[PDB]
């Protein structure tokens, strides 16, 4: 179908306790395949999926030296950011980066991403046209002009259209049986007396890949937990609705997921 | 693979 490569960077300063910690993970769709951690005893990029272990030493060495350089670039960014927000030299701060490419079955670039958060908030992000930036606040506007001047977007778009696309091509080819799979969610509805008056109706979805799923009770009274990973390369989720007794019949759980032919309609058995 | 200098790796905020 339509696939994605994405890298997730986190740089965390810790003034006095040394340099910021830099950590990276890379995903293809919902599957993680590499990690890097500057605090590791022997910092190198490491495989986190079977199908990427195919890459030779040159792959690991170059990616390792690039993370180390990115960490250094992030250190400078964190310095700049601390100035922009007039912050104390003593506080720890967090810079999050996410970038990567979406393609269709065509294998052509469908969409590019290149975004940043600072201390939990959106900072700056590359627009879908890959030629312009959206700054979140007055601070990120400094960065904006800086990159406008330097024509940063073109560098970004270049990678996004070229390397990212190509690399994603290679990984989907090697992880073939395991990247373009589709595991449908196993489902069931549980019932749970809260009182003499009412009970909880909880709708389960288990064992599915990828993580994308929709799940509703037919909202103001619907509890919805975050989709969660199983430790297998699979995901779980459920939805609750507090419901009076002798009344569970007028309630309907609806389940949507790509791995299934029938967008499910469930009542409590 | 992560982006190198041609893709933004040396471009700070």
């Amino acid at each position, epitope marked *: 179908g339509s696939h994605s490569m994405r890298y997730f960077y986190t740089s965390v300063s810790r003034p006095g306790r040394g340099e910021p910690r830099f950590i990276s993970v890379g995903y293809v769709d919902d599957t993680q395949f590499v990690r890097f951690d500057s605090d590791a005893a022997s910092p190198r990029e490491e495989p986190r999926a079977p199908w990427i272990e195919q890459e030779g030493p*040159e792959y690991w060495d*170059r990616n390792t*030296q*690039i993370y*180390k*350089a990115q960490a*250094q670039t992030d250190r400078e960014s964190l310095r700049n950011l601390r100035g922009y927000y007039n912050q104390s030299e003593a506080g720890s701060h967090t810079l999050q980066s996410m970038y990567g490419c979406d393609v269709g079955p065509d294998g052509r670039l469908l969409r590019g991403h290149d975004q940043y958060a600072y201390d939990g908030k959106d900072y700056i992000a590359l627009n879908e046209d890959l030629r312009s930036w959206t700054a979140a606040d007055t601070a990120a506007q400094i960065t904006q002009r800086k990159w406008e001047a330097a024509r940063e977007a073109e560098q970004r778009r*270049a990678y996004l259209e*070229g*390397e990212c696309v*190509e*690399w994603l091509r*290679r990984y989907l080819e090697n992880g073939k049986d395991k990247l373009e799979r589709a595991d449908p969610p196993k489902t069931h509805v549980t019932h749970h007396p809260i009182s003499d008056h009412e009970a909880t109706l909880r709708c389960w979805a288990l064992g599915f890949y990828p993580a994308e799923i929709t799940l509703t009770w037919q909202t103001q009274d619907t509890e919805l937990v975050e989709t969660r990973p199983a430790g297998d390369r699979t995901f779980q989720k459920w939805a609750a609705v507090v419901v009076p007794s002798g009344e569970e019949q007028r309630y309907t759980c609806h389940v949507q997921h790509e791995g299934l032919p029938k967008p499910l309609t469930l009542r409590w058995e | *693979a992560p982006r*190198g*200098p*041609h893709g933004g*790796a*040396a*471009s700070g905020l």
Partner: T-cell receptor
Amino acid sequence: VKVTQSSRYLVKRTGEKVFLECVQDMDHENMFWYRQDPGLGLRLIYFSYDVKMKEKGDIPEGYSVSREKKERFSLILESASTNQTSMYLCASSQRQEGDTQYFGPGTRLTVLE
Amino acid sequence: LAKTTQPISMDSYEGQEVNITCSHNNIATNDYITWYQQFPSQGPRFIIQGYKTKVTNEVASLFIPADRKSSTLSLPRVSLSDTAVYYCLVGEILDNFNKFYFGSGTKLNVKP
């Protein structure tokens, strides 16, 4: 685009410690020392990607370098030998475009017994 | 070692287009292709760089076929002063990481 070198022609006796200077005024993070020899093209001796930072190139043996300031990258032949007779070419580049390198005018060095 | 291969030398007459094909079969996905021009008694100078899309400037055009296994430097109708060594380089460089190696290049002799 101003990369300079101190010497244009040098004759040295074997055993002498020989100093070659390279200065750029472009605030570049990278500086490089190459030698160019007939048939072999340019071979990297040492590069420096920032003040105080040194990285051996493909042929570091018999050389040292100095990057005590960002502007200047010195090459030292610790104990000159005849096979160090060559054309020495300095270059510099920006961290963000390390493969867009600006070259000095070169130093012809001849070491004799 | 040299990841680029190119002719040691070539001859051309003034007024003719000159094409220089460089081989780089083992080019990595993250490598860029960069060419330098070295006039006699001068250091090389950067002249063109590309990744995949054709590039043209006032000095040259750079052709890169689909697989990026090779690339062609195209000099417009040369004059005698275009006599020089042309280097084809493939690689990546940042901080301590330097996979960016010159090689011997193509000595271009332009004849009157």
